[PDB]
Design a protein around this ligand. Structure first.
Ligand code: SF4
Ligand code: CL
Ligand code: CL
Length: 303
């Protein structure tokens, strides 16, 4: 097959040129399979910090590769599609952050890791879907500014009991807007299945689910839940990751959900990336120094 030629050439070039391939959980299965590591954005960035290699091929979207770069400034990070981006992250702007800082100067700015690097330079702390509840609990203030996802922010408020001011207006991920009627229909079909949905899902979806977790948390649930069948309310790429990790279980998509920007990465342009060793992720040194502060603040709170 043309794919078998591509995979062979990819593995050949990545060994010859000293590249470690890091793929996000939402990449196509063919790219997850040729990666050295598959995980969420913070997992991949922290994994890179342990590598002796100085070259990384990242398969995801731009804020994730930049996150790798921020925590690994001396490594060459390349991406195969430089336009792979996150529309939810791009809806939050420096102007909106400063507008709300001025309206509420006592409320720390908590920025979901899903954010532009420029916005990260303006945050008081960064958080992931997994650690957002704990990060906000540990902050002194009972009021926080949170962005750029309103559903994760409102979930944090439910769990912490703190006041969470979300920016921008209607900040959301289109991939996770499942219908709660899909949970009703799937519990009829699989009455003993466990339903796991992302915290980015709307509240009626989260409230009808057995678990609410990020992708990193979804793949630890079968370690403590013996259920044969799990229904997954996140992007379709996680089904492949889950089935590969727990082949003795069945994983059913709540609905078919595809992030188009995640699907911009293919075998073809991944091969092109290794052939040309482009496109390198470059940030201004000042952006790296500034964005590190809210990231280090998150490590300190979590540890
Ligand atoms: S799945 Fe949603 S949050 Fe993730 S990159 Fe795509 S649009 Fe952004
Ligand atoms: Cl982990
Ligand atoms: Cl480095």
């Amino acid at each position: 097959h043309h794919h078998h030629h591509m995979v062979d050439e990819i593995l050949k070039l990545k060994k010859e040129k000293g590249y470690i391939i890091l793929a996000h959980n939402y990449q196509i299965p063919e790219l997850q399979d040729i990666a050295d590591f598959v995980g969420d954005s913070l997992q991949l960035a922290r994994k890179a910090m342990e590598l002796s290699e100085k070259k990384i091929l990242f398969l995801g979207v731009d804020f994730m590769a930049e996150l790798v770069k921020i925590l690994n400034p001396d490594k060459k990070v390349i991406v195969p599609d430089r336009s792979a981006t996150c529309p939810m992250a791009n809806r939050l702007t420096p102007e909106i952050i400063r507008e709300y800082r001025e309206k509420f100067p006592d409320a720390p700015v908590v920025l979901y890791v899903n954010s532009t690097s420029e916005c990260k330079t303006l945050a008081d702390v960064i958080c992931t879907a997994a650690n957002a509840v704990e990060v906000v609990k540990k902050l002194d203030s009972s009021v926080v500014i949170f962005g750029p996802d309103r559903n994760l922010g409102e979930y944090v408020a439910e769990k912490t009991g703190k006041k969470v001011i979300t920016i921008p207006e209607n900040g959301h991920c289109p991939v996770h807007q499942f219908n709660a009627e899909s949970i009703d229909a799937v519990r009829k079909k699989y009455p003993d299945a466990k339903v796991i949905v992302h915290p980015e899902c709307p509240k009626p979806v989260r409230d009808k689910a057995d678990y609410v977790g990020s992708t990193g948390q979804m793949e630890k649930i079968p370690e403590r839940d013996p259920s044969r069948i799990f229904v997954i309310g996140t992007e379709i790429g996680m089904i492949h990751k889950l089935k590969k990790k727990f082949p003795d279980r069945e994983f059913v998509p709540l609905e078919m959900a595809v992030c188009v920007n995640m699907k911009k990465n293919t075998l073809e342009n991944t091969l092109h990336a290794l052939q040309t060793e482009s496109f390198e992720v470059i940030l201004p040194k000042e952006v790296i120094e500034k964005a590190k502060k809210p990231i280090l603040r998150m490590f300190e709170l979590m540890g």
